Structures are given as structure tokens and as C-alpha cells.
Design a protein around this nucleic acid. Structure first.
Ligand SMILES: [Ca+2]
Ligand SMILES: [Ca+2]
Ligand SMILES: [Ca+2]
Ligand SMILES: [Ca+2]
Lengths: 223, 226
DNA sequence: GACG
DNA sequence: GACG
């Protein structure tokens, strides 16, 4: 274990103005902080297919809408139900120093070490979040936090279970034979991610501990 | 209007170790911050009964579990699904200065003025939160914030809708009267905060009007205990 | 009452 | 791939 046992997993999901090729900006951020004990206490899914796991009783949640500096791409606005104009009309603030202070205080309430988990996080959420934080004078709140990509995790878990798309929805439906709800809301998709990570909680925690890496090593999506 | 038009309503719900006579401590806190426009964006249904309204798309959320400094009362533990032992196994921190810093930073993201809305808040959540903040070595982040009790609000809205002494204004009683459905996730902070949001979305314009007329400073809320 |  |  490169960094010991992770005591908190923080499921991260972002909405944004678009895809990496577009130099996107964040428009919504959700964190679900779950203690490793809560994950390892998830009851063993029985049946075929198993029911969607119940979220743990104890889950710290932070869900925020964020005004971007540029317009949302048409597809992004359609699927997320957000737009720059409506966010501004409702007085949503930019990704700013106060937000970094907020994140710091929320992270500080979680037992360490702590590991972010995001779906395709290594190619999307982590680099994007690194870019957003790099714009601020405030030192990054994530410099002591770890991260892993849940696509890699589920590939490993599924591989061990049965020696295929790994999109969030494809996995959820494969595991549970249900359709994800509130797709492309940061909280809806974060909850779906939590559910897939609860499919085999012990195995997931084991993989996370083995593959956690410092968020400080994530390269910004763009400069 | 005593304090202008409220730009954000923050629906507040707490779970705690017990009821007032027990000098309770907070074990869970949820804030749902909704811009006044967002409440107004609620689609108007003309069904009878109307369907439970969708929450607005834009709603900032903060939901936190908090370890108390004494055991939960057995009744509170059963009702809430929380216990000091389980909060502690899961590494929850106390209601401390960092929590106030977190609350302060969250409140700053909301367009001002903000008005807290809690069900029986005048007799429970507001005095309890005032008590918890008063223990800290950091300034309360609520001295520039306003508050109202949704029991008074719904009594007023229901009376105006059908010109009340013979009914309950408990959270679930109102919800069922308006929507003919049972509330879900009762006695979780977020679950009941969402139920409260739904009852406040029943008649959004009338609710906002009443809130503007009755908002009072949180700084004037007397602590539950000292 | 109504809040846990 | 898969992320909005
Ligand atoms: Ca995502
Ligand atoms: Ca998403
Ligand atoms: Ca309550
Ligand atoms: Ca409650």
C-alpha cells in the first residue's frame, strides 16, 4: 500500500461547459465523503441482479452550482440543464478563493488519508479541477489528498468477477439492470458512482488503497 | 418590508441528541440554498392534488454528520438512525470552529440577503444552532442572516387558501394534506429538509411574500441553553 | 403543540 | 475508450 489505508473516499463529480478539447470550465461540483467503514459495512448484495445498494446513513455531501467564465456548449447545456445565463441570473459565484476555503474546510472534516474517486477522473475531473484551482492565489486544498479513477477500479473488479462499455451508465445498468436517475447532475451521477462502488465494497477499497496516488501529481487539463 | 426582499432561502434541518429539555447537541445538519428566482421557476400544476414539485435545478446543498459530546437519547437514536458510537466509528468531528468556517464559506456563495427557513425553527433549530455557535471562538457567520419558521408560514398560507385550529402543522401532516403522499426519508436531515422544500414550493410566490414580510434577524434568536 |  |  503506497499510501496506507484510505480512511475516507470522496466521490467527486463535475458538470462543465464541455469536453476536454474545448478548454471547459466547471459549472457544478458534488462531493460525497464516505468513511471506509461505511463502505466495508455495506451489506453483501444478494440476488441476480442485486438491488442497488442503499447509500450509507453517514455521507457528508457538498453540491454547488458554479458560474463559468464562458458559455456552455449546446450539448452540455442540454444534458446538464444548466447555462451560464441562468447560473448568473441566480447569482451563482465563479470558481474563486472563497470556494477553495469552503473545500478546504469540508475536506478537513474527513479522516485522513482521503482519496477522491471520479469516473474517468484521470482524464477529466482531476485535470479539470487542477486547472480551476491553479487559477487561484489560495494554495490548493487538495495537495495532501489522493485520487483514483473508478473506471480502472471497475475494470479490475469486473475482471476478477468474470474472467463492454465502462461508461457510468453502462456499468450501472450491467450491475443492477436499472437506469441511472438524474443523469448529468453532479449529485445524481455522484450517487450513481457511489452505487457502483458499493457493488463489491471490500474489493473496491482494496483496489483503491493499492492505486491511490497524490492529487498533487495530476497535470492540469490546460494552462 | 422589514428587511428587504430575501434573495436566498436556506432550508435548514437538524438532527440532534434529543429534545429541548435535554440540552441537546446537533448530530446532523443540512442546508438547501435556493435562489428566490428558482423557487419562482417551480412549474405551476393545476391537478388535484398537485404532484409533489421537483426541487429546483439550482440548489446548493451542504449535509453533514456531527459527533455530539454526549450520547444520543435512545429515542433520538432510533428515530434518526444516528448514534454517538456510529458517528465516532466513522470519524465525525464535533461542532467546532472549522465547522463554522465551512458554514461561513458556504453562506458566502449565496446571494444576499439570505433567510433560513426551518420547521418549528423558532422553538427548535434556530435556538439550538445559536447555542452551538455561541460555544465557538470564531464569530457566528449568521449575524447578517435572517430567519423564519415554516410552521407560521404554512399556517398563514393554508388559512388564506381556505378561510386551522383543528389540524396539525407537523411537517408530515402538512405534506400529506398538500400532496396526499407520505414523506420519505423521515428524520434524516436532508430527507426532511427536502420535504420542507416541497411544502414551501406548494405556492412559491405566496411563500416568498410571507417570508419577506416576516423575516427577522438571526442575531435576535435567543439561545436554547447556555 | 412541535421539534429530536 | 469516455468525460460535458
Ligand atoms: Ca462525470
Ligand atoms: Ca455527471
Ligand atoms: Ca426538524
Ligand atoms: Ca428531521
Amino acid at each position: 500500500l503506497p499510501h496506507g489505508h484510505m480512511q475516507t473516499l470522496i466521490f467527486l463529480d463535475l458538470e462543465a461547459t464541455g469536453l476536454p478539447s474545448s478548454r471547459p470550465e466547471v459549472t457544478e461540483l458534488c462531493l460525497l465523503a464516505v468513511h471506509r467503514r461505511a463502505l466495508e459495512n455495506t451489506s453483501i448484495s444478494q440476488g441476480h441482479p442485486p438491488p442497488v445498494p442503499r447509500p450509507p446513513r453517514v455521507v457528508d455531501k457538498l453540491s454547488l452550482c458554479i458560474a463559468p467564465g464562458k458559455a456552455c456548449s449546446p450539448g452540455a447545456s442540454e444534458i446538464t440543464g444548466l447555462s451560464k445565463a441562468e447560473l448568473e441570473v441566480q447569482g451563482r459565484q465563479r470558481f474563486d478563493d472563497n470556494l477553495a476555503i469552503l473545500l478546504r474546510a469540508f475536506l478537513q472534516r474527513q479522516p485522513q488519508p482521503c482519496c477522491l474517486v471520479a469516473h474517468n477522473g484521470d482524464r477529466y475531473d482531476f485535470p479539470l479541477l487542477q486547472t480551476e484551482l491553479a487559477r487561484l492565489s489560495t494554495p490548493s486544498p487538495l495537495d495532501g489528498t489522493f485520487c483514483v479513477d473508478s473506471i480502472a477500479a471497475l475494470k479490475a473488479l469486473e475482471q476478477a468477477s468474470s474472467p463492454k462499455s465502462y461508461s457510468l451508465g453502462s456499468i450501472y445498468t450491467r450491475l443492477y439492470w436499472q437506469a441511472p436517475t438524474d443523469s448529468h447532475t453532479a449529485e445524481g451521477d455522484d450517487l450513481t458512482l457511489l452505487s457502483i462502488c458499493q457493488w463489491k465494497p471490500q474489493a473496491l477499497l482494496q483496489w483503491v488503497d493499492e492505486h491511490a496516488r497524490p492529487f498533487s501529481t495530476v497535470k492540469p487539463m490546460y494552462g
